[PDB]
């Protein structure tokens, strides 16, 4: 066994807490410290402090005193993780490690905004001329939360043309995008269907790609 | 506070090669490195510890080296497994830290974009936002240059972009270009053009469209 098993992702409000777990198995959870790593596109991995097991000693990164805690349960063999007075900033994919093994993350998300199910807008080409051997078409997701939405072209049968992008955010709310490249004998002849789905507010909407008029 | 220093950034390898990466702390760290892997939605996984010594269930083909302040991750032969982002970190003193990362990516020949450009749609319009949408797909490498302009004026306030990771059946990388206005600020001009540079081509790549058709 390596073994450590950390806690699910979590979507929390600002101001509130969290207090995140680090489960240990296959060792002596005793015999070697925790330590807790920040992940953040902006600035790469971060320490945050470590704590031992077997003699309670916990070192804090300074950037992160107050902010952080750590704590151990002995016979759980779990270590954990409060973090508290939760702010945008906080928003990252938080490990746990002893050096040698890592758990898998768990990804924390701060945010004030409600569920808020997307607005698909169909991308069809500009009127006159523009068909050339192949055609573009796409399909527009703006303002959902929280993240994940499946985009998906006829469902299936199209997959090879496709190219769908990283939600960015747009303030607060996600934005996505996906393109399609077919050929000139399938659209506008037969119909090209943008599926779009987001379980959270439970929306499943099939928008079709229709031809400027 | 101690540094760690990484190198190269990213690299263009074929399977088969050998490449070498590097880390450097600002002192001496007397052995005290971890060389780690990082996949795409994975678990970080330790190939490497105290700095050349190997690690559990780990080909032979990683092999760390280094001394003192310098230290050197090997890989004889990069595997098709072996793409993601390497690590190094120091856990000498603490704070612990770490190294910035290596992205390794694949190799592949020159390829210039096909660029579309997408009207907002009249439904959108309806609610008071217009999305313009310049998409660029298909090129390699990586590095590209995306210029927006409404009516010949460089537009730089209000640009969004996205990209995707190498396509993994082309090697090309995509990019979604998004100016985002007011409908009221989108109907006072007429000409909205999106302009691509690249190295395939010295002239830039223009795709534009007239918002009454003419």
């Known amino acids: 066994q390596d073994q450590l098993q950390q806690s699910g992702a979590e979507l929390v409000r600002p101001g509130a807490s969290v207090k995140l777990s680090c489960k240990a198995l296959g060792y002596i959870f005793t015999d070697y410290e925790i330590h807790w790593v920040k992940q953040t596109p902006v600035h790469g991995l971060e320490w945050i402090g470590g704590?031992?097991?077997?003699?309670?000693?916990?070192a804090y990164n300074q950037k992160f005193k107050g902010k952080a805690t750590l704590t151990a349960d002995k016979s759980s063999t779990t270590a954990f993780m409060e973090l508290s007075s939760l702010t945008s900033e906080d928003s990252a994919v938080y490990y746990c490690?002893?050096?040698?093994?890592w758990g898998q993350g768990t990804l924390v998300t701060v945010s004030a905004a409600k569920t808020t199910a997307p607005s698909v807008y169909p991308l069809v080409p500009v009127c006159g001329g523009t068909t050339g051997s192949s055609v573009t078409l796409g399909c527009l997701v703006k303002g959902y939360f929280p993240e994940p939405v499946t985009l998906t072209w006829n469902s299936g049968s199209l997959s090879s043309g496709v190219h769908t992008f990283p939600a960015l955010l747009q303030s607060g709310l996600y934005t996505l995008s996906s393109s399609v490249t077919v050929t000139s004998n399938t659209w506008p002849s037969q119909t090209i269907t943008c599926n779009v789905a987001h379980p959270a507010s439970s929306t499943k909407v099939d928008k079709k790609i229709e031809p400027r008029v | 506070d101690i540094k760690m220093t990484q190198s190269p950034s990213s690299m263009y390898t074929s399977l088969g090669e050998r490449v070498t990466i590097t880390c450097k702390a600002s002192?001496?760290?007397?052995?005290?490195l971890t060389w780690f892997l990082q996949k795409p939605g994975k678990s970080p996984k330790t190939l490497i510890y105290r700095a050349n010594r190997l690690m559990i269930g780990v080909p032979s083909r990683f092999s760390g080296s280094g001394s003192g302040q310098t230290y050197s991750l090997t890989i004889s032969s990069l595997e098709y497994e072996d793409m993601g982002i390497y690590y190094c970190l120091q856990y000498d003193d603490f704070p612990l830290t770490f190294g910035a990362g290596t992205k390794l990516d694949l190799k592949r020949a020159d390829a210039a974009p096909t660029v579309s450009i997408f009207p907002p749609s009249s439904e959108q319009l309806t609610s008071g936002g217009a999305s313009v949408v310049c998409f660029l797909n298909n090129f390699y490498p990586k590095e590209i240059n995306v210029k927006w302009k409404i009516d010949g004026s460089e537009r730089q306030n209000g640009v969004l972009d996205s990209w995707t990771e190498q396509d993994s059946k082309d090697s090309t990388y995509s990019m979604s270009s998004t100016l985002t206005l007011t409908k009221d600020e989108y109907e006072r001009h007429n000409s909205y053009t999106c302009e691509a540079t690249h190295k395939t081509s010295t002239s830039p790549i223009v795709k534009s469209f007239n918002r009454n058709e003419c």
């Open positions: 704590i031992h097991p077997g003699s309670s000693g916990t």
């Open positions: 490690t002893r050096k040698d093994y």
């Open positions: 002192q001496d760290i007397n052995s005290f």
